[PDB]
Write a protein that binds this ligand. Structure first.
Ligand SMILES: *Cc1c(COP(=O)(O)O)cnc(C)c1O
Ligand SMILES: *Cc1c(COP(=O)(O)O)cnc(C)c1O
Ligand SMILES: [K+]
Ligand SMILES: [K+]
Ligand SMILES: [K+]
Ligand SMILES: [K+]
Ligand SMILES: [Mg+2]
Ligand SMILES: [Mg+2]
Ligand SMILES: [Mg+2]
Ligand SMILES: [Mg+2]
Ligand SMILES: [Mg+2]
Ligand SMILES: [Mg+2]
Lengths: 316, 316
């Protein structure tokens, strides 16, 4: 191993682990994106978007980064911004995890907490409006714009997507990924299908997410699911869509830690639930590749709380 | 990169990063032990002790692991126990981090919380007694015994110690490590001095820790510092001892994240404070190697709480 000159050099090249115990009749490979130094998969677009902007003169040391975020992208941006010497303001709402908020603040990022919900309860439109307000009033700014920025999916194309095809050189029969912005499934599937053109691309979403037009219900988990259809998404590149509810997702997390000792976050539970559904239809022995976006540490009062689990069971 | 057959294969081979910004006049290399898959340096002894016991027939699938622990070793043991199919009971007290406790429980470990303090307030003697009670009543048990188990320092000798000398082949002028059980500084210094016999070995402890006979005061940080002199410790192998108080440690954490974007735990702050003291005495340009045991995520209500920081400032 060589010395890194900064923490940036340890982004990527994350482990790939076969889930022998959880999936004894298929060859299931899990890309451990949560082992990125910032703690989640969002290290990939944070590093890639900011470095691209700097290289091409859109971002200088004077440029103020702006984004509306839940925890994970906020934390990743804050880490990269801090390393690069850039100001960052995260637009957030009162639904953000209290611990994720403290982490963002620890990295020295500014936080703009919106307080007014719309007449109907959501803070989405309020956050959208606050981002535009900041772009109007903070001179020299760069909007990360994760739902529309092509650099998002490109980061995953060059990131785990490239590492997946280097490692899993055997045919990939199914690639299974959770969706939020869809940057991950778009970028990784594009890279995968260059090498494995017959790979089936399987999106996993939360029940109540509007990405693929499910009927909206209250959703507890971050990361997976969205309240908008992302501009990034090209539906024709998706071959199968599986929705999983929050109880299902949480059971998936608890099963993964029980069977493999892997302590992962909500959306990882979602893809465990979805792969268990998928394997009732596909061929025994299939090669399945998936990604595990973040750690269980960010879900102690969600998935890994027994009282929360019982409440989600009741929602079914 | 190759596929791992389990999470165990991703223990170790952690990044080494030069701290160019924080230490512009010395060559300071930080071993990122917090990037172990379980989240801290304690992955090393947990894996090594348990695998050694299994190899040598002291531990079978029926053997119940016992240890009195604060968070980090408890979490690491729980992860390894879960992967190996072993029962684990952690003896803990009410001072344990609420979040670390939830993490231990998430990994399916049993928890024995002691409630009676001694007449003088500490739970140390109560925990010591509870461990012996469990060893008496739980047939087929294995006491991890971290303060006395030679496998503790051996794990660090074979672990980061070996990786440090492989990577830092240039002369190591100073090796700086925090002490708790002293397994890390004993094992790593032993390996380092095989290659670099003139390396000076610098222990960093918390003010109020009795490891090197400081006057006891109330201590806020886990990991670094102890309320016993560890059997593992051989003082003759220590060349310099620096004590740092909790305010100093916390300023070190905040400076490290501000200068390098590295979000590390309390004892990392301790060794930043200690290295800043050390460099007032040593030669410019010296090569210093250190270890960063855990992440800032476990210190949001400690080091990274502004109100907590002000309270520690008042303790000086
Ligand atoms: C970002 C994220 C996702 C979804 O990834 P996208 O690239 O936005 O589709 C899933 N889970 C977690 C935890 C995430 O942070
Ligand atoms: C265990 C630990 C230490 C001290 O290491 P020892 O090998 O026990 O001396 C320091 N910091 C943290 C966070 C630890 O968990
Ligand atoms: K927006
Ligand atoms: K959304
Ligand atoms: K004990
Ligand atoms: K102690
Ligand atoms: Mg097999
Ligand atoms: Mg300006
Ligand atoms: Mg990358
Ligand atoms: Mg230099
Ligand atoms: Mg028995
Ligand atoms: Mg090791």
């Amino acid at each position: 191993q060589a010395c890194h000159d900064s923490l940036l050099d340890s982004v990527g090249q994350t482990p790939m682990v076969q889930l022998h115990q959880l999936f004894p009749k298929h060859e299931v490979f899990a890309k451990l994106e949560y082992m990125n130094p910032g703690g989640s998969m969002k290290d990939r677009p944070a590093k890639y978007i900011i470095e691209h902007g700097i290289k091409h003169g859109l971002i200088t040391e004077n440029t103020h980064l702006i984004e509306s975020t839940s925890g994970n992208l906020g934390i990743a941006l804050a880490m990269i911004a801090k390393i690069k010497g850039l100001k960052l303001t995260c637009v957030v709402d009162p639904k953000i995890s209290p611990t994720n908020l403290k982490i963002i603040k620890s990295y020295g990022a500014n936080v703009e907490m919106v307080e007014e919900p719309d007449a109907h309860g959501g803070y989405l439109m309020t956050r959208i409006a606050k981002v535009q307000e900041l772009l109007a009033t903070i001179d020299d700014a760069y909007w990360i714009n994760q739902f529309a920025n092509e650099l998002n999916w490109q980061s995953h194309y060059h990131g785990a997507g490239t590492e997946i095809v280097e490692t899993i050189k055997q045919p990939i029969d199914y690639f299974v990924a959770p969706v939020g912005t869809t940057g991950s499934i778009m970028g990784m599937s594009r890279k995968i299908k260059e090498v494995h053109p017959n790979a089936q691309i399987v999106a996993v979403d939360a029940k109540g997410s509007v990405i693929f037009g499910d009927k909206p219900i209250n959703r507890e988990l971050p990361g997976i699911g969205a309240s908008r259809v992302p501009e990034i998404l090209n539906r024709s590149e998706i071959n199968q869509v599986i929705h999983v509810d929050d109880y299902q997702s949480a059971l998936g997390c608890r099963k993964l830690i029980d069977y493999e000792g892997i302590f992962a976050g909500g959306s990882t539970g979602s893809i465990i639930a979805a792969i268990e559904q998928l394997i009732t239809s596909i061929e025994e022995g299939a090669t399945i590749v998936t990604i595990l976006p973040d750690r269980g540490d960010r879900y102690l009062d969600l998935v890994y709380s027994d009282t929360w689990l019982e409440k989600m069971k009741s929602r079914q």
